[model samples]
Target: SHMATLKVIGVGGGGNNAVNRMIDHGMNNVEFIAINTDGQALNLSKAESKIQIGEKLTRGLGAGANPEIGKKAAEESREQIEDAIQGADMVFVTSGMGGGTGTGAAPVVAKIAKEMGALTVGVVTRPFSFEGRKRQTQAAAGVEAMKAAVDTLIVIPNDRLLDIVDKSTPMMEAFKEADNVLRQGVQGISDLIAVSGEVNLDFADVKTIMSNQGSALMGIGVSSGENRAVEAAKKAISSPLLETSIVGAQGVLMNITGGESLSLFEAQEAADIVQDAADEDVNMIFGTVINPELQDEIVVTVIATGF
Candidate 1:
């Protein structure tokens, strides 16, 4: 495939399932490489094509840190991850519940990707502040470590999802909903890369976006009016680039869930906002809103590619 250059690899847990879904959807060209301590983490997911490392670690989903498992997963995947990174142009690594496998393996994977001459992006979900005073603090440390290792890091907060979803929602529903937000966000880039257009977003361009945020993932939901949440997201990206620096973005992915319609204006707005933060060479961009009618909400997930 001509669009095969943009290869996305899900590093740990959150990424694993989404990859499974994407594959099930029949994205034959995209490669799914799973990096985890236990074989089951990747095996249990939907990815038929995966790279597994023999490591063990706690997901820290809502639990506190398990230092032992964290170390084990990281060491196990260090070499295997390098092998996966070897011919990929752009790679996105996501691991949520940072206490164990994700925290440890993410850094090692990022290092290997960098070494393999690929643009590396990391997506991490932060534990709720209420998770624990100690867990929050240690998670912060783990985040900092991940930040240093990757090109761009997008951090999602689990607590924020609770705010978006109702109290009565099932755990599985909430998990999938939040996961949708992250997947939508990254999908913005992947879709843009997969389909050919005016933009030529390459691996190096991806690296620049990742570098700017100093390894951070931040997503926001905007409540736009009258089934136009997607339009609102487009509006975010429509702004013009003021600087003449070497901008390197590839495409846009628009994910919408609520409301009747997401106007092109809204997606343009999103593009404009990202353009302000991005260099001029961005080849593609993704704009998507999930559950648009759900309280008039619009979600914006940004993963930095080129700094």
Candidate 2:
């Protein structure tokens, strides 16, 4: 199978920042773009491509945290958005919800990506409770709207940052961690479709599962013990990162990567454990890749849709 062309589009300030972080972390053969109304911010973004929308409407300024303005800005620059996503087989949309540009422009970009025949997955972060109920409510509405435009949505709450990082951690470090997690998510899906595996999971396999009606939940688990595959599978299914349960998932794609020592029995055990956690009739696909660089550690990536 050939490698699928992929594009990662970052919207608004937070989205641009996250994309910048992902670039620093490194991605191969993926085009990166940053979209924003604020010319200054867009200029600051070091993406391979940059689009400044609503130059006349916002006058190169921001959307002022207003979703309506954000929507109008994207509408004004619809052509640019479409061009950015054109020819991509898969598109990854990243944004911070509750704000103007991200909350509004995200769905617009997702819709355009779908129109371009690209499989779209959105990774968005909700505002912290401390940011107030209004922003949180706005984020909820934004997510619901975005859900309709994309094949799968991964929602991460900023309030939950405490779960992954210490309370005493610096604000910059915390944001860095959040950005890194999102990077992992995009990278996981990209690798699952693009990398040739022993069991051989191609883009078609991912498209079949993602074409369904529900949002997808993705989780990565790592282990290095004797029963690492089993442990990784369990952690992936029961991961606290997922806000929803996998029991009702209509489709599942499980990928395991480990060192050369990884036994076939262990790989089968991992697949069995994941299937056992889901409905008996769930359509599940499993793939394995032997990466000697991983040493004793095993990495499990799970993607489930149609909850």
Candidate 3:
């Protein structure tokens, strides 16, 4: 089969801002999709088109917060996701807040994507701890519930970003930078999973390796040292194998997205670094890297198996 690059789905409210930034910065190979019923999710989708889900339906947080509405909408989004994941090589689902469409629906959709055979990675952002005990609880529960369904769950705390911003920086600047860092984490992994050249892994190979790592960070970046890249690639192979290989251990699945077209020499270095990082033996690795002018940035997401 031909090597298909990465597909990033930004599934959240304010969180969608990060994905939009990635696209704006220059991730032409990536596709952006957002899930939000209210107009709120649209801000992030500003430059790009978006799909509106359950617009007429009303939803919120907690019991009676929106009654059965939230659950119903989640089911609806699940169907949409099932359709979206059909041909997807790698899917990154991100969500924030414990309420609303993207937040409520993300976990459900990620689960469906995986069951449908798409390598699924979820970058879930949590609300500020001060947002209210209920919100915190929901965010925590959402992580647990989604972990059971998705291959890998990358949890980010919004409060951490808040602390970084404080009163020193403008709220927008703080947010944008923190969001970029999140994307950096995603980009870092993406660079490795999809970079082009010799000793490369195609979509299926990447997917297989990612599905194997199980919570392991499958990362990518340029390196002149061949041994270093191989070491990275080997880690990609080892991380997952080690997890499942254990007698009482559990298995994991990971999804990596990237872009970096390099020479055979550079590819070897990149692969070595990636494999070395995954010395634990990964079960799967799905990714893409076609950009020629690339640097050292682990810009990618990791979706792995849970215990």
Task: Give the best candidate by TM-score.
Answer: 2
Model 2 clash pairs are: none
lDDT of 2: 0.84
TM-score per prediction, in order, is: 0.65, 0.93, 0.66
Task: Estimate, for each residue in 154-226, the C-alpha lDDT of model 1 and write its tens digit.
Answer: 6666776666567688866766655554455455556445534322444344444554355333343355566
Task: Note each model's CA RMSD in angstroms.
Answer: 8.1, 1.9, 6.9
lDDT of each: 0.55, 0.84, 0.53
TM-score of 1: 0.65
Candidate 3 per-residue lDDT, tens place, 1-307, comes to 3545455666556546767777767765566776656555464384354655565574322222331344456576666656655677667777774665555667677777777776777766677777888877777777776677666655666776665655678877766655554465455545444455333444555555447333433322222333434434433433221112212213223322223633456444443343334454534343434444544322223333423
Tens-digit lDDT string for candidate 2 (66-135): 8888888888888988988889998988999999999988889888898899999888889988999989
What TM-score quantifies how close candidate 3 is to the native fold?
A: 0.66
Q: How far is 285's C-alpha from truth in model 3 (Å)?
A: 9.3
Model 1 misplaced regions, further than 4 Å = 1-4, 21-28, 40-42, 50-64, 67-69, 198-208, 211-230, 234-307
List the candidate 3 regions with Cα displacement exceeding 4 Å.
47-49, 59-68, 77-79, 162-167, 185-194, 212-307
